Ligand SMILES: [Ca+2]
């Protein structure tokens with residue numbers, strides 16, 4: 239069980255998996271997730287992913303609780319920090 | 326208080342240990358309490374308590390959650406505690 243973030247729509251391009259936690263921009267970058275990059279993600283059923291527009295869990299928040307082949311044009315390429323919960 | 330979370334240097338509650346009350350402890354604060362970085366390998370948790378262990382300082386990076394006595398955190402979580410939140414409920 240992990241969250242996998244994808245570069246492109248429909249789980250395309252580069253992908254990186256992360257365990258529960260609170261990831262800043264620099265921490266995402268270390269994990270090989272660039273800024274303004276996430277377009278789709280897989281979420282284990284039961285889990286919650288809070289995707290933030292700005293670093294340090296600020297700016298607009300989008301919430302995902304299931305596999306999302308397309309985040310939509312509002313949330314697309316905006317993830318700069320993220321909180322992942324196994325609940 | 327006598328009830329506390331006890332963190333251990335080695336697997337199976339081995340080596341040096343440090344007990345902490347509920348709170349939110351950064352890296353420097355852990356160090357002050359005599360817990361070095363990347364050091365924790367096992368821990369004891371009072372019933373009803375929650376321990377959120379964080380890979381990085383300031384409660385960021387991967388988070389491992391413990392609600393019971395844990396003789397071994399696992400190789401992925403091993404020697405990676407850099408900050409921690411302890412809850413009494
Ligand atoms: Ca993209």
Ligand SMILES: [Ca+2]
Pocket residue numbers: 333334335336363364365366404
């Ligand atoms: Ca150790």
